[PDB]
Structure 1
Amino acid sequence: FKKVAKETAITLQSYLTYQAVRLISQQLSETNPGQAIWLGEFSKRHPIQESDLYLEAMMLENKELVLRILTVRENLAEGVLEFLPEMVLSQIKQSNGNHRRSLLERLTQ
């Protein structure tokens, strides 16, 4: 329950980073298509799932954008983290409900 929470937090760290790049990209696509297109070719070269390696690699190519990510991911984290436990737990119960109903019906079908 602690190894699990560590692994989960790390995954969320990567995930929110990803989500930051996504948002920045929606904006670049409108604002600097050159850069937006650049970003795509970059994330193909580099696996966003590795948050830090992704950033460290990008430090070598577009320092301004790396800093913008760090800021945006943190904004997102503060906008979003707090509502997560309610939303996930409630979603799991609902999904657990549906899957149980489904398979208990399926057993007798």
Structure 2
Amino acid sequence: EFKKVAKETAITLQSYLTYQAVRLISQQLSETNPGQAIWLGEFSKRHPIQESDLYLEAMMLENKELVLRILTVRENLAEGVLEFLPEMVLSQIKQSNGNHRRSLLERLT
């Protein structure tokens, strides 16, 4: 059942945490190096960040130092967030479900 889904999910997280790394970096850069922050946003315009690898591939050709920073940042981000994810997602679902099904229930009366 699961391993098929769990894999697809993991790919999705891989791309998403990359996007988050870029955001994190984009924000620091908007303060520290406006020129770079603008460049990075212009790049994200010409390149669909969801294809995380094609994205990083292209950038390697244009700006080696930045993609090197993305690679590090996303790993650290990953480590720091992946710890508490199982529990959060599980309880949030259990809540949402509870809400939705009692929502439906009074929504009848």
TM-score bracket relative to the smaller structure:
over 0.9
**Alignment correspondent of 2:3:** 2
Deviation string 1:46-103 (CA, Å, 9 cap, x unpaired) is 1111110000010111110000000000000111101100000000001001111111
Alignment TM-score, normalising by the size of structure 2? 0.96
What is the root-mean-square deviation of aligned Cα atoms in Å?
0.7
Task: Tell me how far apart the structure 1 counterparts of residues 38 and 78 of structure 2 sit (CA, whole Å).
Answer: 26
Task: Tell me how far apart the structure 1 counterparts of residues 83 and 36 of structure 2 sit (CA, whole Å).
Answer: 32
**Alignment correspondent of 1:43:** 44
Task: Tell me how far apart the structure 1 counterparts of residues 41 and 15 of structure 2 sit (CA, whole Å).
Answer: 17
**Alignment correspondent of 1:30:** 31
Deviation string 1:10-32 (CA, Å, 9 cap, x unpaired) is 00000110000000100000011
Alignment TM-score, normalising by the size of structure 1? 0.96
Q: Which runs of 4+ in 1 moved over 3 A?
A: none
Q: Aligned residue pairs: how many?
A: 108
Runs of 5+ in structure 2 lacking a partner?
none
Runs of 5+ in structure 1 lacking a partner?
none
Task: Tell me how far apart the structure 2 counterparts of residues 39 and 51 of structure 1 sit (CA, whole Å).
Answer: 14
**Alignment correspondent of 1:96:** 97
